[PDB]
Enzyme design. Structure first.
Site, PDB file in Angstrom:
ATOM      1  N   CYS A  41       0.860  -1.199   0.000  1.00 53.47           N
ATOM      2  CA  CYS A  41       0.000   0.000   0.000  1.00 53.47           C
ATOM      3  C   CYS A  41       0.888   1.237   0.000  1.00 53.47           C
ATOM      4  O   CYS A  41       1.576   1.471   1.005  1.00 53.47           O
ATOM      5  CB  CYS A  41      -0.920   0.054   1.212  1.00 53.47           C
ATOM      6  SG  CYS A  41      -2.023   1.490   1.171  1.00 53.47           S
TER       7      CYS A  41
HETATM    8 NA    NA Z   1       1.871  -1.934   2.786  1.00 52.99          NA
END
Ligand code: NA
Length: 169
Positions: free
Chosen positions: A118
């Site tokens: 992410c």
């Molecule tokens: Na991550």
């Protein structure tokens, strides 16, 4: 803002800019895009070596639709090595590829499905307003680079990951 623009320029100033707005289905225009991708990647690598920060290798399949390699991270004189891979989205270069670090998958609550990292809420807007100038060298410099410098120290402190080897051997 002034600070974001300056911080981006500092990181990517000597990385060749890309031109061709073409994705993996765009045949002759995709071949040209792939030339710009390799042109940008190799100059970034060359610049990294001179800065004692040679921190990744990437290669692709014949079609340039699937990329794979490794990145390295140094912390407290220990060297950590991770396999990385991604596919090129059909709508690239508008859509940024999603980097997977498969060996960290299921092993940390930092990972999305398929061991995908992410990036922050600020990565996609930054990429969006640069289309189609940013390429895979810029994905590494602005996406994975800062990610390693936050998340790898964190996983070491939590004792989730171990090193590969000592630094100056
Ligand atoms: Na991550």
């Amino acid at each position: 803002g002034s600070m974001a623009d300056e911080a981006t320029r500092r990181v990517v100033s000597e990385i060749p800019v890309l031109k061709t707005n073409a994705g993996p289905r765009d045949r002759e225009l995709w071949v040209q895009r792939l030339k710009e991708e390799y042109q940008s990647l190799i100059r970034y690598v060359e610049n990294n070596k001179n800065a004692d920060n040679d921190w990744f290798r990437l290669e692709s399949n014949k079609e340039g639709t699937r990329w794979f390699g490794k990145c390295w991270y140094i912390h407290d004189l220990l060297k950590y090595e991770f396999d990385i891979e991604f596919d090129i989205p059909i709508t690239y270069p508008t859509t940024a590829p999603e980097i997977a670090v498969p060996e960290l998958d299921g092993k940390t609550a930092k990972m999305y499905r398929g061991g995908k990292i992410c990036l922050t809420d600020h990565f996609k807007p930054l990429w969006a307003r640069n289309v189609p100038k940013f390429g895979l060298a810029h994905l590494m410099a602005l996406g994975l680079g800062p990610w390693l410098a936050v998340d790898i120290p964190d996983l070491i402190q939590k004792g989730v990951i171990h090193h590969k080897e000592k630094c100056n051997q």
